[PDB]
DNA sequence: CCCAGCTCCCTGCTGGCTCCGAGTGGGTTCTGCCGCT
DNA sequence: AGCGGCCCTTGTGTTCAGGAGCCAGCAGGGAGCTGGG
């Protein structure tokens, strides 16, 4: 559509489901949970494609894909033990550990396994940013993902009770045109983490800054991620 | 799929409809086809933790109702008659079982031979979820969560074609 | 109170007669001392919603007693051997393996049921095949030990077990899943009457709203109003009262459904429907 | 006897019924068109309330026919109406409600 | 006019548009150009983007 | 089990009477109205032991117009009636020079026994009843409204008088609970008079089928 | 929001006006409580649409003949008289009985 | 009561099925498919419970004390160790009509006790 | 059918009037004549129109009954109410 | 309305609630809940009509 | 002078067929190609 | 140069609108009849 810049940019990152507008059950035409961040609530037809027919949100990148040989030497080279070398005694209180959906092995410790992983992730090491990693808790289960198609956004990353996005970053980020420092060094440094819709469920985010600071009462007080700006889930 | 039959022989029996066989198979004969005829290697393989026996109890009809069946040529047998191809001779009907367990059922985990290990691993843990979906101890999913769904764009698209039409080069 | 459908689905399953609607209820009307009380009107309920064995069970247990004198279960060795010192069934004629259910008071006495409507019930249901016996209303836990007399004996406990379980009705009508009881308080379902006086009066009396459909049970049945009884379901109207009953009950259905939300529309429209979905004597569903 | 055969029809207190004709407003329309006045005496026998009625109720023809057929459908037609006739121009409360002339 | 920023409410507009001699509410009055009379009702009135959309009479 | 039994047996009998006389056949005031004290005091209210048996609880009417024309009302003690018992009541009717008679069954009635219902129609016009529907009567329900069976000089003059046949008037089908509870077959006309909101009563005609 | 919140906020109250300004959750489950409207609206269509079509195609030759009774294509009665008083829905409007209550 | 758990044989390692010796008139537990017999000790062959009185705090996991996405609470300790902190969540277990009941956890590591209140 | 005992209503339907100033109207466009006098109307629905208010139109209503026959009213013979 | 709505999840958190006759306890938590925001809803109202 | 096949009929289940709003304005693509006689 | 066939890749292959209401076909079971002992 070469009506306007907007329907442009919009065609552009257009989505569709092929569920068939002859359809009429509202429950895959409802606005889902799940379109946060990642799709335009507004944005859709009013006719006879309602909810079908989506728009992509202005920070979301849907992934390219990536090979899992990588992750898998790195597990191998982990404590991680393989399918076949285990007991099926062993599977009771160890954790899964998928890939793209294919049951890799098992693990005895994984919470110091995600700290890694996602230490690796934020300084562009072997796992690329565009790996999704959803540690299923109470679930045993840990998916890992490197499929394409896996819409994702980027999403501050949170310490303790503060932000890694310091001032130092936003100055190089004012001279970017002198010094070079763009969004690729900003997601390098650790300050920003591209997360998916399946790990969404097991982050928690803050719709801004003000939510980490002291309060009366603590809501929530152990956040691990942040929203850039709440506008952005706008398409 | 990896169903489970509603209630109403004495309990619920759990089934699996394999591809390119149009009759609904029991999973333990699935499971002696793939080379574990031991029951007990069979749960181990489904129900990871035997102090649970609330999961032993559903999965029993399904071992009562196949049980006549112990080794694997002859679930290898079953399955094949049950397809619309059954092959006059037993011979060909194990070898039809063979390749469709081992190239059309579950690809991911592995087409090559000597996977049947890996195979019968996740079909454990597909019963598995069955298992905790109908005993409660999990939730059910949502088939508009987009963290189960896939995006196809020009990449993953345009490869399909480029594959299907070098193959026709 | 209970989900009813209404609108579009409401519409279209009158216009097109449907055998199997989306939320089929009932309207019963209580006659006398029920209406104006509600402990007679509770018993009433109990008498229409279907209870089976398995909404009074707490937890079932198929045990292998060789000797009911010496019983596996400990706590029940009180009341067994009080039942045992006589011979009150062929005893050569029993099976070792027990079938031990135990009730929860709570159901059972929501229900006014006790453990002896439930025996005569087993023991109507399979004759004198299956001996059934129980404790009396004091201890702490409901009680009662079934066994077989005469596939195999522990097989054949869990079939009827979880056989029995289901469609053994100790209570009520089947097809009625559950009922809901309430004071209306629109004057549409009260009780309209004459006084001597000449005024019309609105008694406010119990009414029950049931999530099934079965109105020659319902309606003869003690306590029961046979005459502003009614349901939604029109198949069973003309299947019960016939042609020019369920002309009235389907413009009723339609004025309540375009009235629901405020609107009007003429009777002589509702009329015109109703009629040429039934001047051939059959239910002629628009279709 | 109409008080009854409505008890019967409407078991509910609901009046609200649809007619062809509103009386209350075409007295009111003649009371302004020939200036009645509420206050002095009518000049309205009440026989000439009742005998007209009658003879208006005749005039209603929803069925044409003298057999006893159909006389009674027209009977049954017009019901409801001539009992909202009878209630309304009756001969007490056209002299000390309405006050026509 | 960014969606959520709570740095500009309807408070803050309505105190700035006081200080260059308008109605803080931004209504205004009008004269009615038929025949130059005021009109009762204080109008509303403002800049305001506005688009035109393809779907033309003449197609 | 015992009480309810012959509460049931009562307000059938009561909805017999009220079914004949609504037929016009000579039903008694005393036993039209009965009271469950006055049944059980007359029959008995011990049906489990046999008294009454349901064999008691026959009744014999005859019209008002005409005293020959009687009818039989049965009781069969079996659930599920068969083709054997059917014979057994044609038998007494012939006996007893009767035409007509009413099987109140239990339970159901076999397909066999429905068939000698409709072969013997001509001979004996004898119907089938379950006494699960004759609990109630439902021409005292507020849906139903207030029917009546025309005679064929009423419906000779309906039908010169709208000037139309049979075929043109509405239907009801013989099987309707109310043209079983009146007895009417096809051809005979049914005269419905209901209550109206946009008239006040409302006469319609129903021809059977 | 955390897990296991059945409060007001988490749920979808919307606690703000539209003139003070939406946050952005309660924005997110405005537009639920909206995209259903939609649905709904572009739903309905072919199913009310399908009735109209159908409730007309079985009575779209019922006319009222010149005996002033109802009849079908077939030359079938469904009623003697329209809306069982012979009176269009034009002229009628509502009223009250005053010999009822 | 309790449920019963599947017994297993020795030498095919199949599912043992109950059986009654009418001889010595004992209860033994017996192979479908080989000859192996084994003498049972529980006496009861199957249990269902229809209430579901199921403790859901042995399906409960220590591991859950590590999720950020729920929520924590001083106000309940920890009789355990007495860890002030303590993570709070519902049941959310289907057949369950009581769900709104509240489960705590023990935020403290290698302790994970679990209670209700 | 006896035209002595007609039936049928009296009054002439709005289905009725429409068709005879119809066709009336078609008459008096084909130059037909006319039976009422004339202003300075031009339009055959005019002309055609007064003369129903004239009730002087030569035409006859053949209303159909179900059962088969007919009654024929005249223009003149109905009563016009709109 | 926030600090009744919160009082009503404490009380069926501690099984402080029962359910109503014809609903089930979560039935019954929305039905107050439901309830205790729809009032507000209508109180504010008034008050902005006023 | 009972009785088990044999016939007839009715229940119930499964599977197959038809239906799925009214309109309107633009656009592109395509209506063969290849093997054999 | 014109007539014949057919590409859906798994010759064996995925959903070409999928899902909600009548209707035809067949398995199943109970009643009743009837020629044998
Ligand atoms: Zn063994
Ligand atoms: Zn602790």
Same mark, same amino acid.
């Given at each position: 559509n070469r009506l306007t810049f907007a329907s442009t940019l919009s065609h552009l990152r257009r989505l569709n489901s092929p569920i068939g507008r002859d359809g009429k059950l509202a429950k895959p035409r409802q606005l889902h949970?799940?379109?946060?961040?990642?799709?335009?609530? /507004?944005?859709?037809?009013?006719?006879? /494609?309602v909810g079908l027919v989506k728009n992509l949100a202005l920070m979301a990148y849907i992934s390219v894909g990536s090979q899992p040989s990588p992750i898998l030497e790195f597990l191998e080279e982990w404590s991680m033990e393989n399918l076949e070398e285990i007991s099926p005694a062993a599977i009771a209180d160890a954790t899964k550990i998928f890939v793209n959906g294919c049951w890799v092995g098992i693990h005895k410790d994984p919470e110091q396994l995600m700290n890694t992983l996602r230490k690796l992730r934020r300084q562009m090491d072997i796992i690329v940013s565009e790996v999704s990693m959803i540690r299923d808790i109470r679930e045993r289960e840990i998916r890992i993902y490197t499929d394409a198609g896996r819409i994702c956004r980027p999403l501050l990353i949170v310490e303790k009770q503060k932000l890694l996005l310091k001032k130092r970053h936003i100055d190089q980020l004012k001279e970017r045109e002198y010094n070079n420092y763009s969004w690729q060094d900003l997601v390098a440094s650790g300050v920003v983490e591209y997360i998916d819709t399946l790990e969404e469920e097991t982050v928690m985010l803050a719709m801004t800054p003000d939510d980490l600071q002291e309060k009366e009462v603590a809501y929530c007080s152990t956040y691990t991620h942040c929203e850039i700006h709440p506008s952005m889930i706008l398409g | 799929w990896v169903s489970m039959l509603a209630r109403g022989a004495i309990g619920q029996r759990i089934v699996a409809t394999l591809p390119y066989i149009k009759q609904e198979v029991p999973i333990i004969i699935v499971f002696r086809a793939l080379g574990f005829v031991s029951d007990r290697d069979i749960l181990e393989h489904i129900i990871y933790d035997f102090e649970d026996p609330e999961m032993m109890e559903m999965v029993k009809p399904s071992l009562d109702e196949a049980f006549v069946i112990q080794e694997q040529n002859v679930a290898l047998n079953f399955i094949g008659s049950r397809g619309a191809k059954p092959g006059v001779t037993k011979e060909k009907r194990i070898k039809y079982a063979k390749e469709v367990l081992q190239?059309?059922?579950?690809?991911?985990?592995?087409?090559?031979?000597?996977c049947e290990t890996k195979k019968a691993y996740f079909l454990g843990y597909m019963v598995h979820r069955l298992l905790l979906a109908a005993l409660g101890r999990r939730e059910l999913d949502d088939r508009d969560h987009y963290g189960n769904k896939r995006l196809d764009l020009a990449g993953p698209l345009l490869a399909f074609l480029f594959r299907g039409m070098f193959k026709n080069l | 109170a209970k989900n009813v459908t209404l609108g579009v689905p409401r519409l279209k399953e009158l216009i097109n007669i449907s055998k199997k609607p989306k939320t089929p209820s009932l309207t019963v009307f209580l006659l006398g001392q029920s209406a104006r009380d509600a402990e007679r009107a509770k018993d009433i309920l109990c008498r229409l919603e279907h209870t089976t064995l398995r909404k009074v069970t707490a937890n079932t247990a198929i045990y292998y007693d060789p000797n009911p004198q010496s019983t596996v279960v400990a706590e029940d060795q009180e009341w067994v051997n009080v039942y045992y010192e006589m011979p009150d069934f062929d005893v050569a004629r029993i099976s070792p393996w027990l079938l031990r259910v135990e009730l929860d008071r709570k159901h059972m006495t929501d229900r006014k049921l006790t453990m002896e409507q439930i025996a005569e019930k087993i023991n109507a249901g399979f004759g004198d095949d299956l001996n059934c016996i129980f404790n009396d209303d004091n201890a702490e836990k409901l009680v009662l030990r079934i066994r077989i007399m005469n596939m195999d004996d522990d097989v054949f406990l869990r079939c009827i077990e979880s056989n029995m379980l289901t469609d053994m009705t100790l209570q009520g009508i089947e097809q009625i899943s559950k009922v809901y009881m309430h004071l209306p308080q629109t004057d549409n379902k009260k009780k309209i009457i004459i006084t001597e006086d000449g005024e019309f009066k609105a008694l406010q009396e119990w009414i029950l709203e049931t999530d099934g459909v079965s109105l020659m049970r319902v309606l003869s049945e003690k306590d029961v109003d046979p005459v502003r009884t009614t349901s939604n379901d029109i198949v069973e109207i003309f299947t019960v009262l016939g042609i020019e009953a369920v002309r009235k009950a389907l413009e009723r259905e339609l004025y309540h459904v375009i009235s629901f939300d405020g609107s009007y529309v003429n009777y002589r429209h509702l009329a015109l429907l109703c009629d040429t979905m039934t001047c051939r004597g059959h239910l002629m569903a628009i279709t | 006897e109409d008080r009854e055969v409505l008890r019967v029809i409407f078991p509910t207190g609901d009046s609200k019924v649809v007619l062809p004709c509103n009386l209350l407003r075409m007295i009111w329309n003649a009371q302004k068109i020939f200036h009645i006045n509420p206050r002095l005496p009518s000049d309205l026998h009440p026989i000439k309330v009742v005998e007209g009625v009658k003879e208006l109720s005749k005039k209603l023809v929803i069925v044409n026919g003298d057999d006893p057929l159909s006389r009674q459908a027209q009977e049954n037609a017009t019901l409801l109406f001539n009992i909202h006739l009878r209630s309304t121009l009756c001969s007490r409360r056209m002299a000390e409600e309405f006050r026509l002339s | 006019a960014t969606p959520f920023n709570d740095a500009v409410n309807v408070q803050k507009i309505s105190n700035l548009l006081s200080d260059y001699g308008y109605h803080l509410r931004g209504n205004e009055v009008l004269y009615n150009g038929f025949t130059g009379r005021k009109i009762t009702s204080q109008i509303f009135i403002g800049p305001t983007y506005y688009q035109r959309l393809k779907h033309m009479v003449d197609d | 089990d015992d009480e309810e039994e012959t509460y049931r047996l009562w307000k059938i009998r009561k909805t017999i009477m009220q079914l004949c006389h609504d037929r016009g056949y000579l039903v008694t005031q005393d036993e039209l109205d009965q009271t469950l004290e006055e049944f059980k005091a007359q029959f008995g209210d011990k049906p489990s032991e046999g008294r009454p048996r349901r064999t008691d609880l026959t009744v014999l009417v005859a019209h008002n117009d005409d005293p020959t024309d009687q009818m039989f009302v049965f009781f069969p003690e079996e659930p599920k009636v068969g083709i054997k018992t059917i014979k057994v009541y044609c038998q007494r009717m012939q006996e007893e020079n009767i035409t007509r008679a009413l099987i109140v069954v239990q339970q159901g009635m076999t397909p066999s026994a429905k068939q000698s219902l409709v072969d013997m129609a001509p001979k004996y016009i004898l119907e089938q009843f379950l006494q699960q529907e004759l609990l109630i009567n439902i021409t005292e329900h507020e849906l139903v409204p207030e029917h009546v069976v025309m005679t064929k000089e009423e419906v000779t003059e309906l039908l010169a008088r709208y000037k139309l046949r049979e075929n043109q008037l509405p239907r009801i089908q013989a099987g309707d609970p109310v043209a079983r509870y009146f007895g009417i077959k096809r051809g005979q006309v049914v005269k419905i008079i209901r209550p109206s909101e946009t008239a006040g009563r409302y006469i319609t005609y129903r021809l059977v089928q | 929001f955390i897990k296991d919140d059945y409060g007001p906020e988490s749920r979808g109250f919307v606690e703000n006006s539209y003139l003070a300004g939406l946050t952005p959750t309660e924005f997110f489950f405005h537009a639920m409580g909206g995209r259903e409207g939609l649905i709904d609206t572009a739903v309905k269509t072919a199913e009310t649409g399908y009735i109209q079509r159908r409730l007309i195609k079985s009575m779209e030759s019922v006319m009222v003949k010149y005996d002033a009774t109802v009849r079908n294509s077939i030359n079938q009665v469904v009623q003697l008289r329209y809306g069982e008083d012979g009176l269009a829905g034009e002229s009628v409007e509502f009223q009250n009985l005053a010999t009822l209550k | 009561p309790g449920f019963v758990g599947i017994r297993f044989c020795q030498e095919c390692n199949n599912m043992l099925y109950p059986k009654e010796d009418k001889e010595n008139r004992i209860l033994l537990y017996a192979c479908r498919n080989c000859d192996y017999q084994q003498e049972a000790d529980n006496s009861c062959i199957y249990v269902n419970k229809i209430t579901h009185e199921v403790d859901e705090l042995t399906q409960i996991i220590a591991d859950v004390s590590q999720d950020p996405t729920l929520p924590r609470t001083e106000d309940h300790p920890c009789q355990?160790?007495?860890?002030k902190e303590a993570v709070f969540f519902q049941?959310?277990?289907?057949?369950?009509?009581?769900?709104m009941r509240l489960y705590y956890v023990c935020t403290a590591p290698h302790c994970g006790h679990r209670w209700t209140e | 059918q006896a035209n002595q005992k007609?039936?049928?209503?009296?009054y002439m339907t709005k289905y009725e009037r429409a068709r005879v100033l119809g066709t009336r109207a078609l008459q008096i466009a084909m130059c037909a004549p006319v039976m009422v006098e004339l202003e300075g109307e031009t339009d055959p629905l005019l002309i055609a129109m007064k003369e129903l208010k004239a009730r002087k139109i030569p035409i006859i209503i053949r209303?159909?009954?179900?059962?088969?026959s007919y009654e024929d009213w005249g223009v003149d013979e109905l009563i016009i109410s709109d | 309305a926030k600090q009744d709505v919160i009082e009503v999840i404490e009380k069926a958190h501690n099984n402080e609630l029962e359910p109503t006759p014809g609903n089930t306890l979560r039935q019954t938590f929305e039905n107050q809940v439901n309830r205790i925001l729809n009032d507000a809803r209508d109180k504010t109202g008034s008050s902005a009509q006023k």
């Open positions: 949970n799940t379109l946060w961040g990642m799709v335009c609530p /507004a944005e859709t037809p009013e006719g006879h /494609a | 190239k059309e059922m579950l690809p991911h985990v592995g087409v090559s031979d000597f | - | - | - | - | - | 355990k160790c007495g860890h049941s959310h277990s289907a057949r369950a009509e009581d769900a | 007609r039936i049928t209503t009296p209303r159909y009954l179900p059962d088969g | -």
